Design a protein around this ligand. Sequence first.
Ligand SMILES: [Zn+2]
Lengths: 386, 232, 182
Amino acid sequence: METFDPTELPELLKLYYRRLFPYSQYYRWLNYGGVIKNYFQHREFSFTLKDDIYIRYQSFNNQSDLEKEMQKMNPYKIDIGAVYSHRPNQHNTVKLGAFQAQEKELVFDIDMTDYDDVRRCCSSADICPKCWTLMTMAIRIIDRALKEDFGFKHRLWVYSGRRGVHCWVCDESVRKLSSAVRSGIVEYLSLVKGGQDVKKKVHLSEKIHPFIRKSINIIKKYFEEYALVNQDILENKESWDKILALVPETIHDELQQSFQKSHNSLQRWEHLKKVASRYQNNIKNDKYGPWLEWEIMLQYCFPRLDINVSKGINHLLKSPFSVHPKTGRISVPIDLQKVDQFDPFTVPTISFICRELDARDYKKTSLAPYVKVFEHFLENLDKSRK
Amino acid sequence: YPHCLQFYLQPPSENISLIEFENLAIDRVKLLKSVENLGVSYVKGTEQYQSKLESELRKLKFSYRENLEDEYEPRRRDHISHFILRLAYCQSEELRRWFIQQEMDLLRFRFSILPKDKIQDFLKDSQLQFEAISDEEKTLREQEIVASSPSLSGLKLGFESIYKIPFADALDLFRGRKVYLEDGFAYVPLKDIVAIILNEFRAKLSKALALTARSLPAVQSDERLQPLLNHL
Amino acid sequence: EQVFHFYWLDAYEDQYNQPGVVFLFGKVWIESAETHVSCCVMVKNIERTLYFLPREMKIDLNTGKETGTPISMKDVYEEFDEKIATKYKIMKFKSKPVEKNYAFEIPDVPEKSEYLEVKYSAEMPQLPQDLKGETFSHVFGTNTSSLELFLMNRKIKGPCWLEVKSPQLLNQPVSWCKVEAM
Ligand SMILES: [Zn+2]
């Protein structure tokens, strides 16, 4: 997954900035009806032209000159940036050390490289439907997390285009909470804690957290299908050798015994469960628990979190419907209403949306559908405004 | 037992007797030193640690039964006592430490005896979210509360008036996965209520404390308050 | 042009007795006795300098209300032209715009601003210090000290060796040194 020729990108942005951007809807979605003064003007942008010359201190008063300059330059990477304490483009006027970042929309990102600890379907630049099963399942848990135990309803979801998916939520006041709260929620959702260094990455303690209960109820509906259908992870020495090396040892030979007398990958896990029923997670009491087996399942499909992007007030990320030149693909709105019907391969690139319009507004092609999610969130905002 | 238990605030600009001034000074300092000693002797929950203190403290005129608005005697004594000793320890970290730490533990103790209804209602009078659940929710959410946290054993959780919260100040009860969640309105036993009360108290208290220490020179032009200027 | 080495110790001047006039004093290498002897230096060409800090509006100075117009360096230059000559009859001047800095006790003005740097010889008299115009906010550099002006312009590090490039001789010696150079 990438782009194949930067030759078209100049003219593509040339037309896009001209007549392919919800400058009305965007000015709205940012300024938020202008309910606050010096609200938009300090809401920052960062722009990146040829050779990736990324530059801070970018902002314009209202939609008109915003457009005019966007079309004057056509930046090739655009980050929305927190409303810092004062005038961004005139930052160096006040006494130094007095310009900082007050209030930021709360951001989240999850990578596909996250799953690379076991991901064997495709590469770091190439994908397939198998890994995308994760981009279909993981978001469900994270979404419903904020949908049922965080008292928010201003959620918005996008897939970057190459690896990550984004969530730029602008909740009533969370836009204006302390970095401490950021780190807090991060710590909260950071359940399976594993990169490429530690093996027993989940020392899940005894008593569960009902959050984890709903997590499980989601796991036993969407993991095993992908696992033993799209991968059949018990296929050769390679995969399960990246598996059995996190396990206690009293039975650690029976699993391989089931490994290499096989014509499928089902009775293996079946006898796994069986011996677990005769295994003792607790030598003390009669609570034979799914600690290790479900740690296995979850860790093999769990949203790996970032420890610095979901707390900092300096990392800025892309704009709604701003092109990712290095995939063609542009920001695709993602919804629970669409999680059951998404495919990454069919959704269009900048090249493809261009060839779409290369045939008045977004009101003709599938871009009006794609921004139905946008204007839907905006509708909710109208309902958010009293 | 008295209204006394309250979060210190709003210096009471009366005008008073010089005698009563130094009296309150000495009294309160005695109480402090004592509490420290009594504490370091035993462990907290021991009933000596209760009996002895609830004897001494009641002896020095600070905790009796119901009376009028604020000009009841012992609450007034507590009030002016603190808001004097404030002028005592504004000249070290070690000092300000010791003072904070001691007042902290005192308030802990002196507060741990109020009747439950008085507890919750005075919390209500304190700030906004300081509000209680309905015990029906105990039945409704026993699974959630018990299985969620390891801070409770079995099914025998007493009839504690559990509390509704904003997560925005739960900043450790939840990130450590120690509580059930209802849209950040987590429900936690009284223990952590005391904890959080005491922590916000420490914070706000230090935040005030530093100010006077940044505003000393006034006393420098008097010498009646020469002992407590820096001589306790 | 000719030149000759010497040293300098004293730096004396006075505004009133004569403005735009400085005096330097020190030692001068002399070959006749193979030593250094007395001499001085008179100095003309002293420049009062101003930094015009602006507003960004045509605000009525008699009621204090904005009106909705930006400011150009041309604009403040115009108000200079037609305010100095309005009450001080500028004979000729020179100026450039510069973006400069300030970090001291003056309210609400920042360390990064527009300024119209206006030079002119000390010949012209001075003004009220906190002066302002209808379009601009203030001007720094009114009560300046010609001495420190020369110093912090030419950046001299205190006592040090010097020589005299382009030395032109004076009208009538009024110092008491065997030699003199203007
Ligand atoms: Zn693949």
